Design a protein around this nucleic acid. Structure first.
Ligand SMILES: Nc1ncnc2c1ncn2[C@@H]1O[C@H](COS(=O)(=O)NC(=O)[C@@H](N)CCC(=O)O)[C@@H](O)[C@H]1O
Length: 463
RNA sequence: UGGGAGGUCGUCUAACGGUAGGACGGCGGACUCUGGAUCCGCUGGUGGAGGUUCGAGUCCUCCCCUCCCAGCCA
């Protein structure tokens, strides 16, 4: 009888703040074997959409969040749109009017900012004309409390609160009413949402017992925030899952973070969502707001790029290119595997991984100013690039140890300083001053590609 | 202000009432080469006050701040 869901809202895209709350119900529904449902909350006709109401599922899907019921697929307890159900929220909203719980509020047409009176009677002689009309829920005295699964005994004073509209003039449910209705008809066992709703729960409870139903289990976990410590959205830089996927951040690496920022770890903070099911701590999560951190995220991501199998990585890297603009060249899979096995221990993102292996692939790579302005332009940099092609020319064996021999046997030949000899060969074959092990670089780049890049630099030296 | 929720290094997080520790960042070594990366190291916090105590992040009280609900937003 376990059925937890996630009620999104079509408004641009989804960020880590929302995804994290989604990841929870996902795992939970899996640890207990319950059903996970997807319910798009688009009751706000003003900010309604479809595009932004689609980019959400794709991302979640990319996050590895599979859902049982949803609008994208089938679903008996549907429809799954807080808009394609204006036939249900109707009769129910009118049933509350019976028990004197909901009264038709008649508004003034002359001014869209004036109220007339209160009445349970149906204002046919007003709505038919033009006078906007809604439906409010009368709040009676008392204390509407509940047992939060994280906050505990949450007691509230209905007195401090009052009649709140539950039906927009355009015959559209607001939210507190839309939730209660779909949180019962869809038979939801547990409701695990953010924390900004912890204040709305009371308003909802009064609706449950109103219809004579039985509210489910409510729990409100911390909220991922930004720098100013405000509820994460988009104004906090770029915390949209869509963004990360662009920058080249793995999925398993990001997931391992959301379940690390707020939700703790029973050992090594580095892991995956799989090996964390049976060891899921529904309550042992977080209790306070958690600021998002790119640095910790990128750090965690970079590591996953080293633990996972070599094959696993390349696959994801391939898919990334298709997502982003510029694509990958055409090279030997075994050669690509090597260069991809040498540059993976330097970059912490797929973007940085591509912008570093480019020289290993394409040969029309440029030369960063640093290299030229610092070492290359040095009058005593050409003579060093001379023996660089000579010694190597003779080298019958082209491996690390061997290539390692030549290099060191140069910096100590009066030719030039230690680093000077290394940075010249480096940028000569990579075009950058920051690349993988020079012993690996010169190695993986075979013997031919090397000599060419040595010549190239030479011919260019002449400004 | 009304009502809720929460405060430990810059950030995420440990501490039977009894050592404020561990990580990311940052700064520094090392890697008989580069450094985003790799091993370690290094400072850095109890939101601020009174009191109960041999002693309090931990217990009581006052003060301060932060986020949410006080929309025909969700
Ligand atoms: N800055 C933030 N940090 C961390 N969590 C955040 C968040 N902003 C929203 N959330 C949480 O993400 C989920 C979806 O957000 S949302 O698309 O706006 N939808 C809604 O708020 C409501 N339709 C949810 C209905 C319900 O569960 O009762 C909701 O659970 C919401 O509480």
């Amino acid at each position: 009888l376990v059925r937890v869901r996630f009620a999104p809202s079509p408004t641009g895209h989804l960020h880590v703040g929302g995804a994290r709350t989604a990841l929870f119900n996902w795992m939970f529904a899996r640890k207990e074997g319950g059903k996970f449902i997807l319910r798009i909350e688009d009751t706000d006709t003003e900010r309604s959409s479809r595009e932004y109401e689609q980019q959400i599922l794709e991302s979640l899907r990319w996050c590895g969040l599979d859902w049982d019921e949803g609008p994208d697929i089938g679903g008996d307890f549907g429809p799954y749109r807080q808009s394609e159900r204006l036939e249900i929220y109707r009769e129910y909203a009118e049933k509350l009017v019976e028990d004197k719980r909901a009264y038709y509020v008649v508004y003034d047409k002359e001014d869209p900012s004036k109220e007339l009176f209160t009445t349970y009677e149906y204002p046919h002689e007003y709505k038919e004309k033009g006078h906007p009309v809604t439906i409010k829920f009368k709040v009676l005295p008392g204390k509407t409390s509940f047992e939060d699964l994280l906050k505990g005994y949450m007691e509230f004073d209905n007195s401090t609160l009052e009649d709140f509209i539950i039906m927009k003039s355009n015959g559209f449910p607001t939210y507190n009413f839309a939730v209660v209705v779909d949180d019962h008809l869809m038979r939801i066992s547990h409701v695990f949402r953010g924390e900004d709703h912890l204040s709305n729960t009371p308003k909802q409870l009064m609706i449950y017992e109103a219809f004579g139903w039985e509210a489910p289990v409510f729990m409100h976990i911390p909220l991922i925030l930004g720098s100013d410590r405000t509820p994460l959205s988009k104004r906090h830089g770029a915390t949209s899952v869509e963004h990360f996927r662009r920058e080249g951040i793995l999925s398993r690496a990001l997931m391992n973070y959301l379940a690390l920022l707020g939700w703790r770890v029973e050992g090594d903070e580095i892991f995956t969502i799989e090996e964390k099911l049976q060891s899921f701590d529904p309550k042992d999560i977080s209790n306070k707001g958690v600021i998002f951190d790119y640095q910790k995220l990128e750090w965690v991501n970079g590591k996953h790029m080293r633990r996972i199998d070599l094959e696993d990585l390349k696959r994801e890297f391939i898919e990334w290119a298709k997502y982003a603009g510029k694509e990958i060249p055409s090279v030997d899979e075994r050669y690509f595997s090597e260069t991809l096995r040498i540059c993976r221990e330097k970059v912490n993102t797929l973007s940085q991984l591509y912008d570093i292996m480019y020289p290993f692939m394409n040969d029309d790579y440029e030369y960063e100013k640093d290299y030229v302005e610092k070492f290359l332009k040095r009058e005593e940099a050409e003579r060093v690039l001379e023996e660089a092609k000579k010694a190597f020319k003779d080298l019958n064996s082209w491996n690390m140890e061997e290539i390692e021999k030549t290099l060191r046997d140069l910096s100590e030949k009066g030719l030039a300083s230690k680093k000077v000899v290394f940075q010249l060969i480096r940028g000569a074959v990579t075009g950058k001053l920051v690349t993988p092990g020079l012993f690996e670089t010169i190695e993986v780049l075979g013997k031919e590609r090397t000599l060419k890049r040595l010549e190239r630099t030479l011919q260019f030296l002449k400004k």
